Amino acid sequence: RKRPRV
């Protein structure tokens, strides 16, 4: 749904 870039 949403995802950060780590």
Place this chain on the structure above:
Amino acid sequence: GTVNWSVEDIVKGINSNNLESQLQATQAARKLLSREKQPPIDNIIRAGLIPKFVSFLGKTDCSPIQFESAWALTNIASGTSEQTKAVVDGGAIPAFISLLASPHAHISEQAVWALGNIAGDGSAFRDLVIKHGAIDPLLALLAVPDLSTLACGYLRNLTWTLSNLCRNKNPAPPLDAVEQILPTLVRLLHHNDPEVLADSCWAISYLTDGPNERIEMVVKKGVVPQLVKLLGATELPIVTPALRAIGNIVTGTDEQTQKVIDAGALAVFPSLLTNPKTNIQKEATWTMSNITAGRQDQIQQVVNHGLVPFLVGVLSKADFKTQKEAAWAITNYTSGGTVEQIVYLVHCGIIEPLMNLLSAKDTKIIQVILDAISNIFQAAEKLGETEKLSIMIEECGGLDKIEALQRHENESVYKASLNLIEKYFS
């Protein structure tokens, strides 16, 4: 170099009148926002940095600051709706759409990712991204003769962002946007990569989650055989969305359901109805309930594929939510089936597990089961064998449970139960 800066120092660097100082401060912000234990998103927002990041997205001659600010903004946009809203409020949507055309693949990819987070917030930002014209440049990135020439991570990011443009309801995505996206989705649904396939299936599952005209848009693209193939995949991340899409499709018309049956879906349900993942079992049984709600020739194909014993099995022992879906499948079957189909149902052993579920503390499943019992009794009356069924129900303990339900605080419960005892047990 740029690890563990303070927000104060990031602010001082971004406020300098030195593009290279700004670049290094922006990278420091990116590394802050990229740490996993509670990145200081709100502190960055409160420092007023979002408009600066957004203006850095347009610095064509300093592509590293485009990349760093795109990444920083992506991670802000991955947060709460309020944080995503701060990114949108700063003007980020048209700037990211312009970045889709960047000659630097890693920057284009970062813009794809950002737009996927923004669109993934909800219907309104999804439709706002569409209104700013994201779909054409997104799809142009996939207009190559063989998807295998694109980098795997790039292709996965594009698929995921496109699936967010297909996602959410109230309202569903615009019809024309769906029609524009669907051919590229069909193409991604045939790509060899497991995560592309999973997210393609998710997108299709979103698109089929709605009224029959939406389902028809998908089914007429011919994707049902590929969905059934993916239903048989070994990767659970693929089977879950593929099964969801198939289940959605069989909530439509009997002709749509028939496309699912003709593509061979029923042959996978022995595995699905016994799958060790509880949610797969549950959604397989839900799917079966919307197939036993169809025509008698469709019920008959459930019989021919040997699935009735598998429904007896999930009614006998499964997670309770699955058992309730199986109760629904059984009353749909009994409400729509021929007499011989209902006879066959009883010969498979449905009665005892059905009766045992009358002990359940859930009044809805009790109503469903009582209704099924009435449908079966009506087949028995059409055969003049109501008494043998009465005996069968009593010898397995069912009558105790039915009269215990005569004194149930729900009304239609004790009405149906009482009715059953008056008509069949005297």
